């Protein structure tokens, strides 16, 4: 029931539930980010 | 032209008389040109 | 695009009828050169010549068209100033790395940064030109040839810098190196004549050998323009 | 996309009817290729074959379509010049951090610059190619494998550069490293002062690790066959 008029109005709502196949962003984004993320703790092993 | 001048300067800094030969004229001009530019 | 950015481009225009053919309407020209006195000038592209002629097909006989040719020419100043001058000012530092001494600790900075500036210029020249795979421009051939010269200088620079830092206790190395590499040098035109100072005089021979054969190909391959 | 960019695509083109169907109109073909008489040549892509089929569904029997297939070969020069030549000229410097001696202090510059240049090329072949996850092209797979090889090299290079700069004032010294690293040498075909013996162990452990990189780099590039 809407704001203007005093009758009620039907409608049909469609819902679409979609997933993302994840291998492309796995092989191109979190492999280099997680691969250079293991280099952060390394500089303390290096002699001064 | 500054990078060509500083690779020549960095070449002439690290010489030594075991591996090089001092110029037979460089002493007069460079101990002449240090008090023209107010340096020792 | 072979003589970029000095080339002489050619762009045509076909006027053909649309629903009719050769036995119904017939396109006749009126003036061999199309009219050009309402032209505002164009800034970059000047117009050299502009003819137009009638084509008709001798084995089809349902085909008339009138084709115009535009022969346009670049004015070459702006692309010279922005992409020939910084290209040449970068690529003259290829031969510079052998004139460093090895003791400074600054070889690898120079030759690695020269390789990365060269591949950035190769990608931007390849973003200007079309992706027609028939032909390359002369800028792309020259930049790819000086990039393979720079990575050959990477490999011989790390072999020189391994030869320099040896020691009397670790490296012995045998008679051959003494016999060859204290006789090679006055045929390389030096002027010279106790193992820790022997190894640095091995290292200052071999890059002076490699400065001779890398100023060789830089004036040999650059008359591959001609 | 698996053989990018030497690939051979296959692009479909369907034609149906819009209002009618098989019990009112009936599509049929004339000749079994499309006409290539007014095809001007294109530049980038080049055609090979253009077959035409008529399909029909035997479980429905109210459905015709005429589908053409275009089988296209890409001219491979442009992406070779921009993408294959700097990739091979950068991945030819992966195994060259080991031959570099540890005194000069230049291992980190060479190995960090190789790792960042391979990551920049991996993001360019990310931004060109379509983001399907049904397949992965062979250039990105090979660049990811040599990226894994370069970061294994940077962890073992910082361990070699730690073990070079020890001294008898700091490190106690253990005789286990004498019995391992003076037996190791004729298995690596060498020949040959408490402070200077630590400079000899770091000239062995890299040249062990040079020999297992050339074991790997002529096993991976052999494995693309
Ligand atoms: C080389 C190749 O596989 N081409 C195929 C063709 O054989 C097939 O008829 C069509 C539909 O799948 O798609 C394309
Ligand atoms: C310009 O292009 C047209 C179309 O191929 C050709 O007929 C003509 O000869 C060309 N002229 C020049 C000078 O390249």
Q: Are C18 and C41 in contact (CB under 8 A)?
A: no
Q: Inter-chain contact C123–D82, Cβ cutoff 8 Å?
A: yes
Coil, strand or helix: which one is D33?
Answer: strand
In order of A37, D25, D99, D118, D205, the CA distances from D157 in angstroms are 17, 75, 11, 18, 10
Q: Are D206 and D96 in contact (CB under 8 A)?
A: no
Bridging pattern class, strands C46-49 and C64-73:
antiparallel
Q: Inter-chain contact C100–B10, Cβ cutoff 8 Å?
A: yes
> What is the spatial distance between Cα A18 and Cα D65, in angstroms, rounded to a whole number?
30
Q: Inter-chain contact D191–C172, Cβ cutoff 8 Å?
A: yes
**Way it was determined:** cryo-EM
The residues with which D45 forms a beta bridge, in sequence order, are: D74
> What is the spatial distance between Cα B18 and Cα C193, in angstroms, rounded to a whole number?
9
| Alpha helices, H only, chain D | 77-79, 85-91, 107-128, 138-164, 176-181, 198-201, 205-209, 214-220
CA torsion sign, D95 to D100 to D102 to D107?
negative
Asked if residue D31 has its Cβ within 6 Å of ligand 1, the reply is no
Chain C residues with CB inside 8 Å of B19's CB? 192, 197, 200-201, 204
Among the partner-chain residues A32, A38, A45, the one whose CB lies closest to the CB of D122 is A32
* D91: number of Cβ within 10 Å: 21
Bridging pattern class, strands C8-16 and C64-73:
antiparallel
Asked if residue C12 has its Cβ within 6 Å of ligand 2, the reply is yes
> What is the spatial distance between Cα C114 and Cα C121, in angstroms, rounded to a whole number?
11
In order of C91, D189, D212, the CA distances from D180 in angstroms are 49, 15, 18
Distance C91 CA to ligand 2 centre (A): 36
Chains touching B (3+ CB pairs < 8 Å): C
Phi, psi angle pair for C61, to nearest 5°:
60, 25
Would you call C117 exposed, middle or buried from its count of C-beta atoms within 10 A (0-12, 13-18, 19+)? middle
- In the numeric block, which tokens belong to residue A47? 């002699």
* C102: number of Cβ within 10 Å: 20
> What is the spatial distance between Cα C5 and Cα C81, in angstroms, rounded to a whole number?
11
End-to-end CA distance of chain A: 74
**Residue C10 Cα: closest atom of ligand 2:** 1
Q: Are C17 and C55 in contact (CB under 8 A)?
A: no
- Look up tokens 């396109």; give the residue: C27
Q: Inter-chain contact C170–D200, Cβ cutoff 8 Å?
A: yes
Among the partner-chain residues D44, D109, D192, the one whose CB lies closest to the CB of C112 is D109
Q: Inter-chain contact C131–D43, Cβ cutoff 8 Å?
A: yes
Packing angle of the helix pair D138-164, D107-128 (nearest 10 deg): 160
Q: Inter-chain contact C204–B8, Cβ cutoff 8 Å?
A: no
Looking at the complex, report in whole angstroms how far the Cα of residue C65 sits from the nearest Cα belonging to chain D. 15
- In the numeric block, which tokens belong to residue C129? 């030109």
Nearest CA to D11 out of D34, D30, D31 is that of D34
- In the numeric block, which tokens belong to residue B28? 């007069």
Classify each residue of A9-38 as buried b or exposed e, where b means 16 or more C-beta atoms within 10 Å of its C-beta.
eeeeeeeeeeeeeeebeebbeeebeebbee
Residue with the nearest Cα to atom 10 of ligand 1? Answer: D69
Q: Are D55 and D29 in contact (CB under 8 A)?
A: no
> What is the spatial distance between Cα C129 and Cα D208, in angstroms, rounded to a whole number?
47
DSSP C115-184: HHHHHHHHHHHHHHS---TT---HHHHHHHHHHHHHHHHHHHHHHHHHHHT--TTT----THHHHHHTTS
Phi-psi category of residue D129: left, alpha or beta, with phi > 0 → left and psi -120 to 50 → alpha: beta
Coil, strand or helix: which one is D207?
Answer: helix
* D135: number of Cβ within 10 Å: 10
Q: Are C63 and C23 in contact (CB under 8 A)?
A: no
Chain B residues with CB inside 8 Å of C198's CB? none
Bridging pattern class, strands D64-74 and D8-15:
antiparallel
> What is the spatial distance between Cα C4 and Cα C192, in angstroms, rounded to a whole number?
49
Please name the residues in contact with D82: beta carbons below 8 A apart, sequence gap of 6 or more: C122, C123, C126
Q: Quote the radius of gyration of chain C (alpha carbons, Å).
A: 30
DSSP 8-state secondary structure symbol assigned to residue C19: S
Decide if D195 touches C, using CB distance below 8 A.
Answer: no
Please name the residues in contact with D37: beta carbons below 8 A apart, sequence gap of 6 or more: none
The residues with which D54 forms a beta bridge, in sequence order, are: D66
Nearest CA to D109 out of D56, D154, D73 is that of D154
Q: Are C34 and C47 in contact (CB under 8 A)?
A: no
Nearest CA to D111 out of D126, D99, D123 is that of D99
Chain A residues with CB inside 8 Å of D132's CB? 21, 24
Nearest CA to D144 out of C112, C22, A39, A29 is that of A29
Q: Which of C2, C10, C73 gets mutated to test ligand 2 (max ligand atoms within 8 A of its CB)? A: C10
Nearest CA to D68 out of D47, D55, D49, D51 is that of D51
């Amino acid at each position: 029931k809407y704001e203007c008029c005093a009758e009620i109005y039907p409608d049909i709502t469609y819902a679409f539930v979609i997933r993302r196949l994840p291998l492309f962003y796995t092989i191109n984004l979190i492999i280099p980010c997680l691969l250079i993320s293991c280099l952060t703790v390394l500089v303390f092993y290096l002699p001064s | 032209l500054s990078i060509v001048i500083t690779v020549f300067v960095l070449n002439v800094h690290h010489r030594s008389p075991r591996t090089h030969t001092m110029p037979t004229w460089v002493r007069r001009v460079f101990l002449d040109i240090v008090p023209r530019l107010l340096l020792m | 695009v072979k003589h970029f950015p000095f080339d002489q481009q050619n762009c045509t225009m076909k006027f053909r009828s649309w629903t009719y053919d050769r036995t119904e309407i017939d396109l006749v020209l009126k003036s061999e050169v199309a009219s050009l006195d309402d032209f505002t000038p164009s800034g970059e592209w000047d117009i050299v010549a502009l003819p137009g002629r009638r084509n008709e097909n001798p084995d089809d006989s349902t085909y008339v068209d009138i084709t115009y040719d535009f022969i346009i020419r670049r004015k070459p100043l702006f692309y010279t100033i922005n992409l020939i001058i910084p290209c040449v000012l970068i690529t003259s530092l290829a031969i510079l790395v052998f004139y460093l001494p090895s003791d400074c600790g600054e070889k690898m900075t120079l030759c690695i940064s020269v390789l990365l500036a060269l591949t950035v210029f190769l990608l931007l020249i390849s973003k200007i030109v079309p992706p027609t795979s028939l032909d390359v421009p002369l800028v792309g051939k020259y930049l790819m040839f000086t990039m393979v010269l720079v990575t050959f200088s990477i490999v011989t620079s790390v072999c020189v810098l391994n030869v320099h830092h040896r020691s009397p206790t670790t490296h012995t190395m045998a008679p051959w190196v003494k016999v060859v590499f204290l006789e090679k040098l006055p045929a390389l035109l030096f002027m010279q004549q106790s193992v820790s100072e022997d190894w640095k005089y091995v290292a200052m021979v071999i890059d002076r050998l490699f400065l001779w054969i890398f100023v060789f190909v830089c004036v040999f391959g650059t008359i591959g323009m001609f």
